[PDB]
From Swiss-Prot, chains A, B:
Phosphorylation state of this enzyme is controlled by isocitrate dehydrogenase kinase/phosphatase (AceK). Succinylation probably inhibits enzymatic activity. It comes from Escherichia coli (strain K12). GO terms for biological process: electron transport chain; glyoxylate cycle; response to oxidative stress; tricarboxylic acid cycle. Inhibition of this enzyme by phosphorylation regulates the branch point between the Krebs cycle and the glyoxylate bypass, which is an alternate route that accumulates carbon for biosynthesis when acetate is the sole carbon source for growth. The record marks 159, 229 as: Critical for catalysis. This is Isocitrate dehydrogenase [NADP]. Keywords: Acetylation, Glyoxylate bypass, Magnesium, Manganese, Metal-binding, NADP, Oxidoreductase, Phosphoprotein, Tricarboxylic acid cycle. Pfam families: Iso_dh. Binds 1 Mg(2+) or Mn(2+) ion per subunit. Both Mn(2+) and Mg(2+) can be used, but Mn(2+) is 10-fold more effective than Mg(2+) in vitro at the same concentration. Signal peptide: none annotated. The modification N6-acetyllysine is found at residue 141. Changing residue 112 to A/T: Decreased enzyme activity. Loss of phosphorylation.
Length: 415, 415
């Protein structure tokens, strides 16, 4: 029997015509998260409640409902229950949810729980905005020049988990087929060879890129850059870029800039000419360091998005405070983007900034922009005040060391 | 008939027992390179000749022999001759060669010429050392903490070019096979879907990792880090890491550090305990910025190596002066690692640092360490003297702007 308790006071968010109908008392499912989730989640709940209370003068209030996934799920439902069917059902049913870091066990043949949540709920958009918060200790000279929003495709690519182990009967079978029936000759060593499949479809590419362009329009952003490795992988990465440009032309009236290949899409609200361009992935990893100001909205495939998001987070000193969201047509799951750091679990020491900023994204997604704005304001003030957790403090001089919970309070105090 | 002229004075380098027998007058094949290759190659030839002349007091002298690949090949041999069979033969025959940047044409269905050279000559090691040269304008605060050597697997991975176009009969065939015979269910959108294959074998992984560990030993390096995405791709990237550790144990007496998974390999010459460790690729892209001093020799797959090498080059301000080598058991091809920048071709303006430093690697590979040391010394002095090309100069104050050829002279002057 389920151990999830539906809040007595609270109402389910609904979806109508692609628009969320959020009540003043929405029930929001939340997954504590493994390791440090025990530290960061309480801080997030308190910070969000304060922002909501302050923004709407007590008129609105979230009814938090704990659901399970990960190590805590096994402890609540038993041995092999890492991801309960009800969790997938509840997230879909309640439309909006948030979670702390999750870890996948090894030895049992189970694949990434984070990816499982994304694929099973068809949350095809991994949204990762990366900006700099003044006062944050950064390894680069000008982190303030970084203000990007990453639209990472979440349902395809090698990240889809389609592969076979070297020497397995399946691997031999696939390799045999490829060589004998497909005439593949580029497999350097066919024996003791692992094989993975990388899929990329037109519908997959277009729904991701459509969301990216719509975001640029809605937020009056300057450009959308299709990042890919099409020079090497023409049929997957290359097709992604091709379909991205095609979508811009076919659905957003994209016009040619100069002799190509860049396009300009007129923002139907501001009249701003949004530039649609593309950069080879490896070169892009250099350009984010060398010319960050030239980039804004980024649209890319699963793996590249994972790399780009992490690299960007690192350079702005946001490795531990990078917000993230997994959005689909029916529901959305916001999440802390860092690991579980089990060594510090329960020490009330880690930075709750990531999950808090992800809650900021959640609030904005629900249409509660005032509360979201309050969290952004609190984070900016706390960081600028140099009242921070150990991860920031250790890289700074003249900073006040704060516990995880205390930093949560600092954010509230700066709202 | 061939238009390659074998130098009258000069002798072929030979290979015996895995050791190169280099004469005092070795014939070295060289490919000018497209675009700026017309600028950087002459500078390289002059710099190398000066280093050789100075190091060995006129006793040794390279007999340069021009061979063709790329745009210049089509002009020398005709319309469709992008990569002549003789070029592959000559490089193998002469054992050591160098080349300027190469570009692959689009529209003719031809794949990367750089990859073609690597795969066809089985140059399985892409060696990319990345260090900082004092005085180089860098986007990071402490580029001097970067001193790494990248061992990128060069014959496998998605980089192998095994793929089929969306809607092609072949793609449909493969997808059908995967779904109906392999029972694959993770292909989100089977229609209008491009497909790529990612292979990774035990022999491929081990020969790359073997070279990496041997390099750490020969150069008394502190550690070898296996970089991979095994948490997501268990059978390719994960297997790579597994085989890498296994090789360390089976062939280099690797011992367990603490409770694992790190290993220590005793350097048989210095007694130094070389640490063998591993880091997930996305996290590694963050760690190179946050904790560069903790890394040294890196062993990774093709694609990850491409990303890591470019990211590292960018952070030390070496985007245009990053050396590179493609090494196999029978021959080796050193190369400028940047693009062709056709806009500046012939303007004697671009930085010849990349191809020159690659020539430094070449000289060292031939056992001519004195000459190689002279080039390193010249580069360090020229850069530190602030007498540099536009790409450096534009990011600095109080620097003397030099043409490509002039920077070549500056290097010589600082030898
Ligand atoms: O894949 C996982 O298990 C963790 C989530 C992750 O690192 C990501 O894809 O960014
Ligand atoms: O692949 C090419 O054509 C250029 C060489 C390259 O960028 C590389 O693999 O680093
Ligand atoms: Mn990640
Ligand atoms: Mn490259």
């Amino acid at each position: 029997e389920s151990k999830v308790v539906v809040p007595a006071q609270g109402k389910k968010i609904t979806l109508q015509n692609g628009k969320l109908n959020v009540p003043e008392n929405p029930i929001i499912p939340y997954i504590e998260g493994d390791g440090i989730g025990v530290d960061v989640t309480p801080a997030m709940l308190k910070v969000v409640d304060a922002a909501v209370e302050k923004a709407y003068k007590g008129e609105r209030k979230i009814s938090w409902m704990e659901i399970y996934t990960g190590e805590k799920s096994t402890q609540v439902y038993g041995q092999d229950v890492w991801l309960p069917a009800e969790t997938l059902d509840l997230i879909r049913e309640y439309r909006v949810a948030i979670k702390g870091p999750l870890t996948t066990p090894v030895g049992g043949g189970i694949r990434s729980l984070n990816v499982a949540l994304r694929q099973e709920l068809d949350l095809y958009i991994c949204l990762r905005p990366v900006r700099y918060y003044q006062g944050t200790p950064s390894p680069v000279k000008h982190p303030e020049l970084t203000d990007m929003v990453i639209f990472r495709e979440n349902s395809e690519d090698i990240y889809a988990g389609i592969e076979w182990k070297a020497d397995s009967a399946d691997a031999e079978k696939v390799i045999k087929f490829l060589r004998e029936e497909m005439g593949v000759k580029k497999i350097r060593f066919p024996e003791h060879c692992g094989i993975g499949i990388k899929p990329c479809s037109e519908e997959g590419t277009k729904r991701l890129v459509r969301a990216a362009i719509e975001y640029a329009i809605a937020n009056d952003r300057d450009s959308v850059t299709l990042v890919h490795m099409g020079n090497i992988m023409k049929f997957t990465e290359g097709a992604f870029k091709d379909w991205g440009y095609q979508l811009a032309r076919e659905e957003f009236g994209g016009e040619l800039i100069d002799g190509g290949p860049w396009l300009k899409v007129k923002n139907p609200n501001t009249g701003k000419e949004i530039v649609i361009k593309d950069v080879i992935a490896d070169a892009f990893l250099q350009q984010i360091l060398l010319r960050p100001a030239e980039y804004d909205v980024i649209a890319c495939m699963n793996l590249n998005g994972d790399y780009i998001s992490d690299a960007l987070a690192a350079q702005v000193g946001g490795i531990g405070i990078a917000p993230g969201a997994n959005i689909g047509d029916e529901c959305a799951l916001f999440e802390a983007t860092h690991g579980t750091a089990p060594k510090y679990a329960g020490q009330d020491k880690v930075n709750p900034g990531s999950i808090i900023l992800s809650a900021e994204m959640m609030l904005r997604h629900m249409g509660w922009t005032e509360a979201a704005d309050l969290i952004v304001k609190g984070m900016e003030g706390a960081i600028n005040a140099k009242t921070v957790t150990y991860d920031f403090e250790r890289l700074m001089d003249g900073a006040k060391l704060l516990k995880c919970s205390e930093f949560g309070d600092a954010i509230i105090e700066n709202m």
